[PDB]
Swiss-Prot record:
It comes from Saccharolobus solfataricus (strain ATCC 35092 / DSM 1617 / JCM 11322 / P2). The keyword Zinc does not apply. Interacts with PCNA subunit PCNA2 and weakly with PCNA3. This polymerase possesses two enzymatic activities: DNA synthesis (polymerase) and an exonucleolytic activity that degrades single-stranded DNA in the 3'- to 5'-direction. DNA polymerase I, DNA ligase and the flap endonuclease may be constitutively associated with the PCNA heterotrimer forming a scanning complex able to couple DNA synthesis and Okazaki fragment maturation. One of its GO terms (biological process) is DNA-templated DNA replication. It comes from the Archaea. Keywords: DNA replication, DNA-binding, DNA-directed DNA polymerase, Exonuclease, Hydrolase, Nuclease, Nucleotidyltransferase, Transferase. Gene3D superfamilies: 1.10.287.1390, DNA Polymerase, chain B, domain 1, Helix hairpin bin, Palm domain of DNA polymerase, Ribonuclease H-like superfamily/Ribonuclease H. Belongs to the DNA polymerase type-B family. This is DNA polymerase 1.
Length: 727
């Protein structure tokens, strides 16, 4: 087909596994840096799709809907460890011939386990594969390659985990390679099409593909800059350059797409921005109405919300940046909108258009079309290929393949890590129902309003993740029946909301703790350490960024009730101990001479205290619980009413309350940047616009319009003065 088979005893980077319905096998998609191509290794083990049932082989054999099904293969018996007790028991295993038979047969039995795992992930779990990592093909199977590490590097890992439990220490050595292994440079082309629209504001159905493609832009990471354009009211195919952009011209759309395929086929990865929904399907269905056979088109659009590029991987980057964990934790909330221009400005700082693109002359169509594709490539290129590296590390940590990962929420990424590790341990992955039944048997402190001076803030570095590990919280250690070493988890009235077993390490506690400690104890440090070469400085930086994404996302996914491993008592125990830690840390500040103005879930705003008293409560947290409290910030001053920070170098951290609006904004911020310890005359400069903006504006909207001017100023005047009227 489009993919050539991988060769015996060559080395490739695994990128993902797919299922081939035709051959009925899992296929590993293997990247070769030498040829810059992707090859296929088809499973040569006996591996088939399956699910588990806790009935007996002879009873399952009397269910004729299973046994007489054409995809029915055979029944076996396997063993699993119960996460709750670590006891070994037996389950029966229904093996069928194809993934679809798993979906069909799993409800012919009362209670099917491991029956909602996509076949290519289930293969990954059982073989023990890690995408984004290098392997050698030995006897048609993948074997991991030798990793060259400094002895000092590995001693440094082992020292940081010497105090941890058996599970953590071996898991730490088992994960090391995925943080020390180089990331491959993968050749890639972002593409972007434009189609003809008679009416201006009307996005054409990409299935119907009613109108011609007028151009396609291709921006490649190997320097390619291309625009293929359809000659509309003229007829010659001459080629030219336009500020570095190779423009080719075509009289028929058939030959335009012909040549788009030829170029596409040079790349192992195609990048789009919303190409799953638009670009690739539009190309695919135009190509069919133009006289391409299905089998000549290296795109498949048979999947529901997906476009596959048959000679490699297609990453739709719309879906990557729209990922909420990527948006918030990878890129610090820098974009609020998910369209190309919004993401590009936030991450690249690169800023429109007169008419619709159907009206545009050839020259402006070419610049505009190419710019879209160029920006799409650059989202993958900025900061020494940061986002290619993030994607690869995210695959490694989640063990999800690249295409599934860039199209899924982080809760799918975390689920996949946890299923993988269960399966490596031979643990049964529990049903969501069973976690509920096996579980069976008031705010943050407010800020006084006004003006307060020289404030230092105190943050818990990563609070919820840190308490997950510190208190051994996991779905299998909270509110369980048989428990030798219980631990009470109270909140306020010493109520004892839940019990937590310390008999065994909880898997969630082990993994979040291990990720966290890999980050703070080793990789944060290593990344900004001058003795490291610049190549490995960048690797370690991405490593710690990516760790951060999973750490900070962990509570949110485990706290959502849709999550397959959601235990209400885990989530509730986390917030409980969160209150307990911040409440308790508040009392110690009140008994050290510290004045506590503001306090949310993991932060404490402190009124200029001595350096002696800060060091007391920090080291006190380390002895009471085992958390790291630290000196976050040092505001020049802050104002309250929801707050309004000010730094001594300029910039302000205005929490909320920022939705005339342009000229007036700049005056307010340079007036507040003047701020010294004075007060009453500082506010009279700003009171010029209270009565001015409110009362003078005479010379859908009528007279209530002036309350919308007041909402970009409502909370700031509450700090200084009080409320007023002008009727
Ligand atoms: Mg475009």
């Amino acid at each position: 087909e489009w993919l050539e088979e991988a060769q015996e005893n060559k080395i490739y980077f695994l990128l993902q596994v797919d299922y081939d319905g035709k051959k009925g096998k899992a296929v590993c998609k293997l990247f070769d840096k030498e040829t810059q191509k992707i090859y296929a290794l088809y499973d040569n083990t006996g591996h088939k799709p399956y699910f588990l049932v806790d009935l007996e082989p002879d009873k399952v054999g009397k269910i004729p809907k299973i046994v007489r099904d054409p995809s029915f293969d055979h029944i076996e018996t396997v063993s699993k460890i119960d996460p709750y007790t670590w006891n070994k028991f037996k389950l029966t295993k229904i093996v069928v011939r194809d993934p679809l038979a798993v979906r069909r047969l799993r409800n012919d039995v009362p209670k099917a386990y491991e029956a909602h795992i996509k076949y290519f992930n289930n293969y990954m779990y059982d073989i023990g594969l890690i995408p984004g990592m290098p392997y050698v093909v030995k006897n048609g199977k993948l074997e991991s390659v030798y990793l060259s590490l400094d002895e000092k590097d590995v001693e440094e890992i082992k020292k940081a985990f010497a105090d941890s439990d058996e599970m953590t220490r071996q898991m730490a050595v088992d994960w090391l390679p995925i943080f020390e292994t180089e990331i491959p440079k993968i050749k890639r082309v972002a593409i972007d099409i434009e189609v003809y629209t008679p009416v201006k504001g009307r996005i054409p159905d990409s299935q119907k593909a009613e109108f011609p493609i007028i151009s396609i832009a291709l921006a490649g990471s190997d320097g390619l800059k291309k625009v293929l354009v359809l000659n509309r009211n003229d007829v010659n195919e001459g080629s030219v350059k336009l500020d570095g952009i190779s423009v080719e011209r075509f009289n028929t759309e058939y030959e335009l797409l012909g040549r788009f395929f030829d170029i596409l086929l040079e790349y192992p990865i195609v990048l789009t921005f919303n190409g799953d929904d638009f670009d690739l399907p539009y190309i695919y269905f135009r190509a069919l109405k133009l006289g391409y056979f299905p089998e000549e088109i290296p795109i498949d659009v048979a999947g529901k919300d997906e476009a596959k590029y048959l000679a490699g991987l297609h990453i739709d980057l719309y879906k990557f940046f729209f990922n909420k964990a990527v948006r918030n934790y990878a890129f610090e909330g820098k974009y609020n909108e998910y369209n190309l221009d919004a993401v590009a400005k936030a991450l690249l700082g690169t800023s429109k258009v007169d008419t619709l693109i159907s009206f545009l002359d050839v020259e402006k169509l070419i610049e505009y079309n190419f710019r879209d594709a160029e920006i799409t490539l650059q989202l993958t290129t900025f900061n020494n290929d940061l986002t290619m590296k993030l994607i690869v590390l995210f695959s490694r940590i989640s063990r999800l393949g690249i295409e599934e990962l860039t199209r899924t929420e982080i809760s799918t990424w975390v689920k996949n890590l946890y299923y993988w590790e269960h399966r490596k341990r031979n643990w049964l992955i529990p049903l969501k129902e069973e976690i509920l039944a096996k579980s069976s048997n008031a705010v943050v402190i407010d800020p006084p309003a006004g003006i307060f001076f020289n404030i230092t803030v105190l943050d818990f570095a990563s609070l919820y993740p840190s308490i997950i590990r510190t208190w051994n919280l996991s779905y299998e250690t909270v509110d369980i029946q048989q428990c030798k070493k219980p631990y009470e988890v109270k909140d306020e009235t010493g109520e004892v909301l839940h019990i937590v077993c310390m008999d065994r390490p909880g898997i969630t506690a082990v993994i979040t703790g291990l990720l966290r400690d890999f980050r703070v104890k080793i990789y944060k440090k290593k990344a900004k350490n001058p003795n490291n070469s610049e190549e490995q400085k960048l690797l370690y930086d991405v490593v710690q960024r990516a760790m951060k994404v999973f750490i900070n996302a962990t509570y949110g996914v485990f706290g959502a009730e849709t999550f397959p491993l959601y235990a209400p008592r885990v989530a509730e125990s986390v917030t409980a101990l969160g209150r307990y830690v911040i409440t308790s840390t508040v009392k110690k500040a009140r008994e050290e001479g510290l004045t506590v103005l503001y306090g949310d879930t993991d932060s404490l705003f402190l009124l200029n205290p001595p350096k002696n008293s800060l060091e007391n409560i920090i080291k006190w947290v380390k002895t009471t619980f085992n958390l790291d409290l630290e000196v976050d910030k040092t505001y020049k001053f802050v104002a309250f009413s929801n707050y309004f920070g000010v730094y001594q170098d300029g910039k302000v951290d205005i929490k909320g309350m920022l939705v005339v609006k342009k000229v007036f904004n700049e005056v307010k911020e340079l007036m507040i940047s003047i701020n010294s310890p004075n007060d009453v005359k500082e506010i009279k400069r700003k009171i010029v616009d209270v009565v001015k903006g409110s009362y003078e504006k005479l010379k859908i909207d009528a007279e209530k319009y002036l309350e919308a001017l007041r909402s970009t100023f409502e909370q700031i005047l509450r700090a200084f003065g009080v409320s007023w009227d002008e009727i």
